[PDB]
């Protein structure tokens, strides 16, 4: 079922979370610093989530993965889980 997914954020700050519709927005899960960058690791489903990044407070996407506007009219990543 899931796939183990390795996300990374690569353009800075101190604190970065994840949220998005692959766990219907219900929580935050953190990156962990490694060297430049920031990873956490999702199992996701097959299919398409979108997700967006809280870093150090705001909420971000990353600007080198391909976006959506959601429903609520914010600008979000997509991914799509083969
Ligand atoms: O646990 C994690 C977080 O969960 C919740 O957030 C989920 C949410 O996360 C992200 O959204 C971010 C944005 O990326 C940020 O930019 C910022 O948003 C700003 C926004 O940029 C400003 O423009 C402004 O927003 C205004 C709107 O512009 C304005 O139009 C008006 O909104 C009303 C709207 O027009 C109506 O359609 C309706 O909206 C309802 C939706 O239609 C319905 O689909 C459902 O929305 C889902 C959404 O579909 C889903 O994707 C998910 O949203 C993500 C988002 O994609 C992502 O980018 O979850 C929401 C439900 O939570 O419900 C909608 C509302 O019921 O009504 C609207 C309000 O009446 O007013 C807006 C307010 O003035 O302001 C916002 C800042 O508030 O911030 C958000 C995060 O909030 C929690 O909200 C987080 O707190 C959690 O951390």
Known sequence: QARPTVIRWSEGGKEVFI???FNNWST?????????????ILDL????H???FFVDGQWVHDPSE???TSQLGTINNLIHVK
């Open 45 to 48: 489903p097959e299919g398409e």
């Open 50 to 52: 979108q997700y967006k």
């Open 19 to 21: 949220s998005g519709s």
């Open 28 to 40: 935050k899960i953190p990156l962990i610093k490694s060297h430049n960058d920031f990873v956490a």
């Open 66 to 68: 391909p976006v959506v």
